[PDB]
Amino acid sequence: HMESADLRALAKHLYDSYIKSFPLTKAKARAILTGKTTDKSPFVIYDMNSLMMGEDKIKEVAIRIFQGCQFRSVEAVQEITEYAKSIPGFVNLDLNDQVTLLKYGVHEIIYTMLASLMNKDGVLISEGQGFMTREFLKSLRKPFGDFMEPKFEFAVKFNALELDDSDLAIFIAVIILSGDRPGLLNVKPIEDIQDNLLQALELQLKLNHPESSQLFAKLLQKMTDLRQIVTEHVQLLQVIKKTETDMSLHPLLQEIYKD
């Protein structure tokens, strides 16, 4: 449908907007995680006392961490929404469909971009100023410990693809413009956009990872991992809500999960 130079033009547009919309890119996250730098070193939270000193440097503990995750997730939804509006064609769609695409897309994107902040040992927090260990997260009390770990399980697998931000920008766009979301009114204009986004992703991956055979297909197979984990996540929230009333969700998240 589109010519090669237009596909490169679209990749560059989406990368540029991705940089403008998201505060902490994978490039910066990797520089902090690998280290070698004295200025970008995070403070590491691995236990209670280090959590106590960290809140000085940058309610029950598992709740406080959980609320920390909701708060950043809500911020992520805002950033994702701002990015979505820059995807060519998105704002021109029926307004109910705009809501529907975001409703079902934000969680799959949050998981994707969370991986950029992760390695096998923990996750960056507070715009990269802190690093909270995986083992500490998994050791939180009964419901919450195992609520944290699946995010890491996805991230190590997804990060083995070695995508960079310019790849992720198009991949994220492809997720949003999914015509198979429930309740869409005009699937066809959404698929026309995804077709160009898919063409753009395909060419991008061929040029940026010429040695990574069938990375396109392998990356699309990860969209399978994203559906299931989002589903598990929702089922865990419902269970936690049924026990914890010292918890309450941001109305933005509340609406997303309803029906």
Next chain:
Amino acid sequence: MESADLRALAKHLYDSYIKSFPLTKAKARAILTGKTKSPFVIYDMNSLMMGEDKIKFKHITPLQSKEVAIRIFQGCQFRSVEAVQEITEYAKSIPGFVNLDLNDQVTLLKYGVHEIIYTMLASLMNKDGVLISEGQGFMTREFLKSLRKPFGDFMEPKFEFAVKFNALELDDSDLAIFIAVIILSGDRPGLLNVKPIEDIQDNLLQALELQLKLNHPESSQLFAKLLQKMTDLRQIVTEHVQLLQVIKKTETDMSLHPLLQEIYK
């Protein structure tokens, strides 16, 4: 891989697909469209009674429950078990498969058959019903969907998937490679040696990509769209398992001869 080798792999898989499965999509479509020998139509109780009397569909004959919705439900189980052997035979023709670790062969088949059965079920389905007994019968969607509370809602999601999947208008040469790709999934739990499985899937994906470009040149990004269907397949298979457990925990008019239970477990 070179272009002609991918065509060789496509043709190998197409030939094997034809020999392994009883009723192809091409022939199933001829029956459903009404082109073809009209199949016997099961649209209610009395027509089921006459079909099992006149044609004697072997998955739909007495054995143990007299209740019809249970009998149809079990008939789907019985045919699924036949298909497993057909899929298993097809798997052995996939280049490289028999050379894998034997436990991995079992693991891949174990975790793949559900996704493949759903996929191939669509070939026998349209929006109005499903072919049975190698195309000799046609059971209507309305009759299946109207079976009493648990069983009606167990049948309908299969049609809903099939209708969406059939809109891709894949033919048998497409499906043969697609089924192969499902089998060679390296993320199945308990695999011992993932690398040779992904190596094979990589070849199969290349062949599927080229096949779809040549067979559907007008169908932009059909490759990507078909891989996105593997999302639908994963989800529906998980739902299906959750649906069975509820039936097992509620229905106790379901007991068969213990040997039958072992076979059709």
